[PDB]
Design an enzyme around this catalytic site. Sequence first.
Site, short mmCIF file in Angstrom:
data_model
loop_
_atom_site.label_atom_id
_atom_site.label_comp_id
_atom_site.label_asym_id
_atom_site.label_seq_id
_atom_site.Cartn_x
_atom_site.Cartn_y
_atom_site.Cartn_z
N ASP A 25 -46.54 17.48 58.79
CA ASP A 25 -46.99 18.39 57.75
C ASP A 25 -46.69 19.85 58.07
OD1 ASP A 25 -48.38 19.64 55.73
OD2 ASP A 25 -50.21 18.52 56.09
N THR A 26 -45.57 20.37 57.57
CA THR A 26 -45.22 21.75 57.91
C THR A 26 -46.13 22.77 57.24
OG1 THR A 26 -43.55 21.72 56.15
CG2 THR A 26 -42.86 21.13 58.35
N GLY A 27 -46.86 22.36 56.23
CA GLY A 27 -47.86 23.18 55.56
C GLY A 27 -49.20 23.25 56.24
C1 LIG Z 1 -60.24 26.98 50.88
C2 LIG Z 1 -59.54 27.29 52.21
O1 LIG Z 1 -58.72 28.43 52.01
P1 LIG Z 1 -57.33 28.52 52.89
O2 LIG Z 1 -57.57 28.62 54.33
C3 LIG Z 1 -56.33 26.99 52.52
O3 LIG Z 1 -55.00 27.37 52.68
C4 LIG Z 1 -54.10 26.28 52.63
C5 LIG Z 1 -54.44 25.09 51.76
C6 LIG Z 1 -53.44 23.94 51.68
C7 LIG Z 1 -52.17 23.99 52.48
C8 LIG Z 1 -51.18 22.80 52.43
C9 LIG Z 1 -51.80 21.65 53.20
N1 LIG Z 1 -52.26 22.15 54.48
C10 LIG Z 1 -53.58 21.91 55.00
O4 LIG Z 1 -54.46 21.34 54.44
O5 LIG Z 1 -53.67 22.44 56.31
C11 LIG Z 1 -54.97 22.43 57.02
C12 LIG Z 1 -54.79 21.94 58.15
O6 LIG Z 1 -54.24 23.09 58.99
C13 LIG Z 1 -54.78 24.33 58.31
O7 LIG Z 1 -53.53 25.31 57.94
C14 LIG Z 1 -53.43 25.31 56.63
C15 LIG Z 1 -54.80 24.94 56.09
C16 LIG Z 1 -55.35 23.98 57.22
C17 LIG Z 1 -50.84 20.47 53.39
O8 LIG Z 1 -49.67 20.96 53.87
C18 LIG Z 1 -50.63 19.91 51.97
N2 LIG Z 1 -51.81 19.09 51.54
C19 LIG Z 1 -51.82 17.62 51.64
C20 LIG Z 1 -52.06 17.16 53.10
C21 LIG Z 1 -53.42 17.67 53.57
C22 LIG Z 1 -52.05 15.64 53.13
S1 LIG Z 1 -52.48 19.71 50.10
O9 LIG Z 1 -52.16 21.12 50.05
O10 LIG Z 1 -53.90 19.36 50.09
C23 LIG Z 1 -51.61 18.86 48.76
C24 LIG Z 1 -50.32 19.42 48.27
C25 LIG Z 1 -49.62 18.65 47.20
C26 LIG Z 1 -50.21 17.42 46.64
O11 LIG Z 1 -49.51 16.79 45.63
C27 LIG Z 1 -50.20 15.67 45.11
C28 LIG Z 1 -51.52 16.88 47.12
C29 LIG Z 1 -52.25 17.62 48.19
C30 LIG Z 1 -51.84 25.17 53.36
C31 LIG Z 1 -52.83 26.33 53.42
O12 LIG Z 1 -56.43 29.79 52.35
C32 LIG Z 1 -57.06 30.95 51.90
C33 LIG Z 1 -56.00 31.78 51.14
#
Ligand SMILES: CCOP(=O)(COc1ccc(C[C@H](NC(=O)O[C@H]2CO[C@H]3OCC[C@H]32)[C@H](O)CN(CC(C)C)S(=O)(=O)c2ccc(OC)cc2)cc1)OCC
EC number: 3.4.23.16
Lengths: 99, 99
Positions: A25-27
């Site tokens: 997961d590069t995100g």
């Molecule tokens: C409310 C909290 O605020 P925040 O900290 C959240 O900022 C994010 C949120 C989501 C992502 C992408 C996902 N990364 C993420 O959750 O990362 C976690 C873990 O490491 C931390 O770094 C980034 C946020 C922590 C992941 O790459 C993609 N997800 C699915 C995965 C968890 C299986 S998703 O985004 O939930 C998703 C995208 C497309 C879809 O199509 C159906 C479904 C779901 C990056 C940054 O920002 C404030 C501005």
Amino acid sequence: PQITLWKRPLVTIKIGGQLKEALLDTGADDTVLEEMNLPGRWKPKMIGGIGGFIKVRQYDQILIEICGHKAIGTVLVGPTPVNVIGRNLLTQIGCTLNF
Amino acid sequence: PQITLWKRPLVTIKIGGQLKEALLDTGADDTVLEEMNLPGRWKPKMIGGIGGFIKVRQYDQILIEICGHKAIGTVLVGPTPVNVIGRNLLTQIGCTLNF
Ligand SMILES: CCOP(=O)(COc1ccc(C[C@H](NC(=O)O[C@H]2CO[C@H]3OCC[C@H]32)[C@H](O)CN(CC(C)C)S(=O)(=O)c2ccc(OC)cc2)cc1)OCC
């Protein structure tokens, strides 16, 4: 290897001596695994995703092997929808994006 | 190009005549972008990740350019905390993971 993205990039990992499946997961900044028993200390942490914040247990300096490549780093354990390998460990195994 | 993962893989995209910044995200099945009032019809959808679900608007057959690479596909629009380019579009630009 070179992994295309027509399917989810799921791989087998080994953590705590047990095999599991996880998503590259590069995100994700961090590595978050579903609830599991892991030996050692841990600290309560909060992390935020697309839907809000969750409480996790932070395990530091944990050995984890991803698709045959070793890493030692921080693993968060809590109610994630799926096991994600984040950039903290992707960097350790030499993973890049290419196009 | 090759993008290392020491920092977030943020790139400029062009969509709806606008430039925005988004993450190349192998963990995202679909592409999710900040509130934008695109023209045309759309269908409601809910997408979930860490922390739960958010409500988004699904737009189909949308033109997006990602570092000069053109793509066309579905974009989900809503109150996402981050813009993510998911696999539905990353495949179209020929993006792979490599280690
Ligand atoms: C409310 C909290 O605020 P925040 O900290 C959240 O900022 C994010 C949120 C989501 C992502 C992408 C996902 N990364 C993420 O959750 O990362 C976690 C873990 O490491 C931390 O770094 C980034 C946020 C922590 C992941 O790459 C993609 N997800 C699915 C995965 C968890 C299986 S998703 O985004 O939930 C998703 C995208 C497309 C879809 O199509 C159906 C479904 C779901 C990056 C940054 O920002 C404030 C501005």
